[PDB]
Design a protein around this ligand. Structure first.
Ligand SMILES: Nc1nc2c(ncn2[C@@H]2O[C@H](COP(=O)(O)OP(=O)(O)O)[C@@H](O)[C@H]2O)c(=O)[nH]1
Ligand SMILES: Nc1nc2c(ncn2[C@@H]2O[C@H](COP(=O)(O)OP(=O)(O)O)[C@@H](O)[C@H]2O)c(=O)[nH]1
Ligand SMILES: [Mg+2]
Ligand SMILES: [Mg+2]
Lengths: 384, 383
């Protein structure tokens, strides 16, 4: 079980150089492959549910943990990666050039990280081989700390390493030591992710089937947590919420006592009629998630050359919102002074659905029109 | 009195080419000067102190009016120019590429145009030599109209000319004709600006004085309008608003009967004690402007190299707000999810001053910290 991290920050501040520096320094101890800057600086197109992103992925391990590291060419790739959940960062490495201090994309990545629930951050104050004046370095560091605090992060205790990603790539051991310092800070500051099996149980219902005399079997993938026979669940979304007692769990055709995250299982609910359950609802640990018709979210509207809309949309745009296994029609309201959202834009929106869906902070959804995906979103607030 | 216009729109949609095309076509009638694209596109960057705005300037006359036309290279130049007011625009020529449709800077320039008070717009749907197929052009046109309307403009009646800036510049007479259609649209849709001397009188008080035998005399520059001896004015700002009759106007050590925009004049006020006036107040036509402690504004934060802050400021920043002649301390409240404003940024803000200052929509001000200018703003709403 590895830890997911990534290099965020303003363009040309040194994310890719730092990524190559980590891999190069760690490869000398046999803890990574010798990944070169030019392999990562290339924009490697990938596809994650309709959204095309240029994104690089490397792997390395520390003395304590193994890491999966994401790095992206463009600011637009970071927006797309974080909203869709294609990245999923247990912790972020914020690169800030000491010669430029905080820049607009530095703030946007930190805000997006707060909205998609990135727990913690470690800062690499880069280009200190250029900005050698310590008073300059401290002024940038104090600005980064204020920025982290203003967005809910622990600016006082966030580790900030003063280094040079370039000179570390060159083999200068004085600057290589900062790469070691950054790795220890990541080991100690970025928490090990909670296993999906310890989270509140959730299963997205795909099919229903009546077992005459006993109840109704609902089938779907357990997204997180663990369910046990005899436990009580809630059926959330679309229809009025209700509780049910699980009397059976089967996967192939064997009868199992439990189901956990990753399982595609049939769940027998005692006394529930097939008309009470439908696709799009979720089984959930009672009280762990609620139904909502109104929510706030950050969205990315796909460009025309990505299969998205060809023109912008206004207030009152009424598309379909795809949540896990089904779509629900909703109406979109826009923030003040945003009167048109164009293809390629990312913006906050407020959505009033016609039917309630089970959603929380961090729920992912696709915006669809005529069956094609025109945008992707991440729920930031349940507003009901 | 010429009309101030300018090309706005997303980068690479043809603003500079259209600017050169307008002059080149009208120069054939002696109504402008033949202008190549490189004269404006490759002009050098600006090498001075303070806020740095890159902008080119041309002149041309249509059949009915004379025009001063400004064209800027970068998006940041348009933000700075419109917020500070150095690019005062009685009307705008929005350039939109028929190949790319409306882009984020197209919407951004329209929003900024409304906040600084640009009343009207004509649209030059450009690159119709590439995007032949009048159906494709008409779709982009409807998108521009919907965008114009969504931001408070009359998108339904806004003149839209389907042209090609390049082929007009190169002398294609079919496309040259669309330059003349654009001039007709500007002549008829862009309203002639109201004369400065005809606007409601405003004077910004700089100095106050007691002529022991005569009375209180306030001195300042007339921002707009005209003041005549015997008229009633209002003293707006820093004190409860009151009225007073003008009994004297002095300039160049002579008693005069009137003062107008641009004049620096000492104004003698009847029944006003010196403790009732002070720098930062304004004299104004009664009811034309009100004092406010709270307002909304679009501001541009100066970069470090422009003499501004080296670091970003947070919610609750309490700087000075320099209005015409004096600064008033005030607190800044930022829009949602904007927790820090960096040097070089532009953002809408809400301000609460410690004292009421006379202000209105379009009032310009500076943000100052320790005496040095760190930002420039334009009031968008008074509360
Ligand atoms: N002097 C110096 N240059 C650096 C450093 N890190 C990156 N650069 C340079 O800055 C430029 C951008 O770095 P890159 O990693 O591409 O930035 P990214 O866009 O944030 O990935 C490249 O030309 C690097 O060589 C550093 O620590 N010191
Ligand atoms: N084919 C064609 N190209 C154009 C037209 N107008 C502008 N261009 C091209 O678009 C590019 C950018 O135009 P420019 O005037 O610099 O746009 P600006 O950045 O808004 O000022 C230039 O290479 C022009 O040659 C047009 O009507 N037709
Ligand atoms: Mg990079
Ligand atoms: Mg230009």
């Amino acid at each position: 079980p590895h830890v997911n991290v990534g290099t965020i920050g303003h363009i040309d501040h040194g994310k890719t150089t730092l990524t190559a520096a980590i891999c190069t320094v760690l490869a000398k101890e046999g803890k990574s492959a010798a990944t070169r800057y030019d392999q990562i600086d290339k924009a490697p197109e990938e596809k994650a549910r309709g959204i095309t992103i240029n994104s690089a992925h490397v792997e390395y391990s520390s003395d304590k943990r193994h890491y999966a590291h994401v790095d992206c060419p463009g600011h637009a790739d970071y927006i797309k990666n974080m909203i869709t959940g294609a990245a999923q960062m247990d912790g972020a490495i914020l690169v800030v050039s000491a010669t430029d201090s905080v820049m607009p994309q530095t703030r946007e990545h930190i805000l997006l990280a707060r909205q998609v629930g990135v727990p913690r951050m470690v800062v690499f104050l880069n280009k200190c081989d250029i900005a050698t004046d310590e008073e300059v370095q401290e002024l940038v560091a104090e600005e980064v700390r204020d920025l982290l605090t203003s967005y809910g992060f622990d600016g006082k205790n966030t580790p900030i390493i003063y280094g040079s990603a370039l000179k570390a790539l060159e083999g200068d051991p004085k600057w290589e030591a900062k790469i070691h310092d950054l790795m220890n800070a990541v080991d100690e500051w970025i928490p090990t992710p909670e296993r999906e099996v310890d989270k509140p149980f959730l299963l997205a219902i795909e099919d229903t089937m009546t077992i005459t005399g006993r109840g109704t079997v609902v089938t779907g993938r357990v997204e997180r947590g663990e369910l046990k026979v005899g436990q009580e669940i809630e059926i959330v979304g679309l229809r009025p919420i209700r509780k049910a007692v699980v009397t059976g769990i089967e996967m192939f055709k064997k009868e199992l006592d439990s189901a956990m995250a990753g399982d595609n299982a049939g769940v027998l609910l005692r006394g529930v009629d097939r008309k009470e359950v439908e696709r799009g609802q979720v089984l959930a640990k009672p009280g762990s998630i609620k139904p909502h018709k109104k929510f706030k979210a950050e969205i990315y509207a796909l460009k025309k050359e990505e299969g998205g809309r060809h023109t912008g949309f206004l207030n009152g745009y009424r598309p379909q919102f795809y949540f896990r296994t089904t779509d629900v029609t909703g109406s979109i309201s826009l923030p003040e002074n945003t009167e048109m959202v164009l293809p390629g834009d990312n913006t906050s929106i407020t959505v009033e659905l016609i039917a309630p869906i089970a959603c929380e902070k961090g729920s992912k959804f696709s915006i669809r029109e005529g069956g094609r995906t025109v945008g992707a979103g991440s729920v930031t607030e349940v507003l009901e």
